[PDB]
Amino acid sequence: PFIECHIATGLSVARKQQLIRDVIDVTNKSIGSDPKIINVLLVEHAEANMSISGRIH
Amino acid sequence: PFIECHIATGLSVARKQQLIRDVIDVTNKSIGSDPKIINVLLVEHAEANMSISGRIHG
Amino acid sequence: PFIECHIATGLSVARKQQLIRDVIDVTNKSIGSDPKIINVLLVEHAEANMSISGRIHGEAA
Amino acid sequence: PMISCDMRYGRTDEQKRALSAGLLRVISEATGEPRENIFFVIREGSGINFVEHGEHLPDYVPGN
Amino acid sequence: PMISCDMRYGRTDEQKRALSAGLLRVISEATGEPRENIFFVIREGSGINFVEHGEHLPDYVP
Amino acid sequence: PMISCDMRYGRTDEQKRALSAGLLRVISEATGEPRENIFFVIREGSGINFVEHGEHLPDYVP
Numbered sequence: 001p002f003i004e005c006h007i008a009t010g011l012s013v014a015r016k017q018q019l020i021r022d023v024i025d026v027t028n029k030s031i032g033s034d035p036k037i038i039n040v041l042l043v044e045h046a047e048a049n050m051s052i053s054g055r056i057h
Numbered sequence: 058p059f060i061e062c063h064i065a066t067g068l069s070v071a072r073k074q075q076l077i078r079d080v081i082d083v084t085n086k087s088i089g090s091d092p093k094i095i096n097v098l099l100v101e102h103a104e105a106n107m108s109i110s111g112r113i114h115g
Numbered sequence: 116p117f118i119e120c121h122i123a124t125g126l127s128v129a130r131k132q133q134l135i136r137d138v139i140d141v142t143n144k145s146i147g148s149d150p151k152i153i154n155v156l157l158v159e160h161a162e163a164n165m166s167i168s169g170r171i172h173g174e175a176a
Numbered sequence: 177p178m179i180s181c182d183m184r185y186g187r188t189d190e191q192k193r194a195l196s197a198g199l200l201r202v203i204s205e206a207t208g209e210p211r212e213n214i215f216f217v218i219r220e221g222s223g224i225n226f227v228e229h230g231e232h233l234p235d236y237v238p239g240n
Numbered sequence: 241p242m243i244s245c246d247m248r249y250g251r252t253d254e255q256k257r258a259l260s261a262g263l264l265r266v267i268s269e270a271t272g273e274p275r276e277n278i279f280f281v282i283r284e285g286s287g288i289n290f291v292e293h294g295e296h297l298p299d300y301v302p
Numbered sequence: 303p304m305i306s307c308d309m310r311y312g313r314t315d316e317q318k319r320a321l322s323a324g325l326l327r328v329i330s331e332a333t334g335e336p337r338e339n340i341f342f343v344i345r346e347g348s349g350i351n352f353v354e355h356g357e358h359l360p361d362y363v364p
Contacts, residue, residue, distance in 0.1 A: 001247035002304055002341055003263070006098055007271050008241075013163050019270040020166045024176045026262030031247075031255045035169030035176040037292050039341045041121055041304055042164040048070045049099040050242070051077045052277045053229070054092030058183035059242060059279055060199070063156055064207050065177070076206045083198030088183070088191050094228050096279045098242055105128055106157040109177070109213050110355070111139045111150030113132060116309035117178055117215055118325070122333050123303070134332040141324025146309075146317045152354050154178055154215045165304070167339050168293065180308070182244070182281045189350050189358075196353045216353035217308045219345060224253050225282040227260045230275040232253075246306070246343045288315045289344040291322045294337035296315075 001027060002039045009044040016042055058084055059096045066101045073099055116142060117154045124159045131157055177207050178215045185220040186236035192218060241267050243280040248287050250300035256282060303329050304341045311346040312362030318344060 003023055011019070020040045027038050047057045060080050068076070077097045084095050104114050118138055126134065135155045142153050169176040179199055187195075195218070200211045207214075223233040243263055251259075259282075264275045271278075287299040305325055313321075321344070326337045333340075349361035 001245050002343060004244045005267060006242040007267065011270065013161075015270065017163055017171050019266060020164075021171055021176055022266040022269070023263065024166065024169050024171075026266055027245075027259065028176075030258035030262050031251055038166070038169045038176075039304055040166040041160065043158075043160070044164070045098065045100070048073050049101070051081070051095075051097040052241070052279060054081045054095050056074055056077060058181050059281060061180045061182075062203060063178040064203070068206065072206065076202065079202040079206070080199065083202055084181075084195065087194035087198050088187055096242060102156060102158070105131055106135075106159070107178075108135050108139065108153070108155040109215060111153045113136055115132075116307050117180075117217055119306045120329060121304040122329065126332060130332060134328060137328035137331070138325065141328055142307075142321065145320035145324045146313055148309075156178060167303075167341060182283070192350050193358060196358065200353070200356065211356045214353075214356075217347065218351040219283060219308070219347060220351065221281065221283060224256050225284065227264070227278075227280040230264065230278075232257060232260065246345070283345060285343065285345060288318050289346065291326070291340075291342035294326065294340070296319060296322065 001031070001033055003027060004041045004043060006043050006045055006050070008047050008050065058088070058090055060084065061098045061100060063100045063102060065104050065107065116148055116152070118142065119156045119158060121158050121160060121165070123162045123165065177203050177209055177213065179203060180217050180219060182219045182221065184223055184226060184233060184236035186238050188238065241271055241273055241278045243267060243278065244283060246283045246285070248290060248297060248300040249284045250302050252302070303333055303335055303339065305329060306343050306345060308345045308347070310349050310352055310359060310362035312364055314364065
């Protein structure tokens with residue numbers, strides 16, 4: 001699987017790497033994919049560029 | 058629905074906010090979705106990094 | 116078709132433009148699509164924001 | 177510009193045409209690009225593939 | 241936040257529900273956002289549509 | 303690197319393998335990454351799901 005995560009800017013480099021690690025871990029545990037076939041992309045956005053549930057920042 | 062819009066950089070925050078509102082509105086009026094379940098992401102790119110209809114910028 | 120290429124930052128602008136040209140060309144050659152219906156987005160990311168085959172710091176998870 | 181819409185399978189062609197008309201119009205107005213320069217793709221999935229407000233969706237059934 | 245997962249057809253509803261629970265949890269933890277503010281979409285395709293370690297995948301067999 | 307291609311259903315497995323071969327080569331040339339490094343997914347949809355030059359596309363006929 002290829003997991004893309006769109007989040008607000010702000011996290012440190014080490015915290016982003018820990019998040020990628022956790023995504024790999026939960027993917028492996030939930031659907032059984034070998035970490036070696038899990039691909040992750042973290043993409044960071046200004047809050048003004050994101051709207052969830054029709055909400056404006 | 059989740060609508061992702063890939064556009065060139067340059068829009069102000071206010072124009073970006075208006076675009077998101079307009080996307081929510083268009084979606085609600087086209088397919089009936091409650092604004093409260095419509096998600097929108099605006100992604101800004103350099104023109105050099107985009108090609109439409111096989112066009113090479115410059 | 117719409118092709119999005121997620122790569123690490125670092126290419127020169129001219130190399131980015133050649134990459135897009137190349138993507139258009141191999142798409143046309145392989146599937147026959149008119150360059151006029153081929154759309155390409157090059158998206159550049161910090162290496163730290165990408166994991167291929169579960170690797171972080173170059174090492175699998 | 178390029179636009180994508182992820183939503184559940186089941187919308188009609190007419191609905192898809194309404195959505196594209198509206199989105200092309202709004203993006204054109206915002207970007208100063210003609211409609212012809214705006215690519216749009218709808219990506220359809222089953223209900224279980226969508227998690228909204230922390231809950232998976234049922235398959236979409238046209239009316240409803 | 242918005243999360244997508246591209247993978248082959250064939251995972252069960254139970255597996256998808258475990259996957260979403262886990263991803264929402266880790267993204268919530270990292271971003272401080274409530275789970276209700278985290279959209280997730282799974283995008284499924286045939287095996288031929290996936291190239292992993294340089295080879296096209298077979299259709300998934302559970 | 304991760305590559306995605308959205309396009310209409312209807313391409314043969316042969317055309318898809320030719321496409322991935324070409325795309326993996328050009329990405330490797332540009333980035334230095336080996337083919338094993340270079341994930342690719344094709345996302346397919348019906349013709350009505352694609353709008354090019356202001357018009358919805360017919361279904362793709364091989």
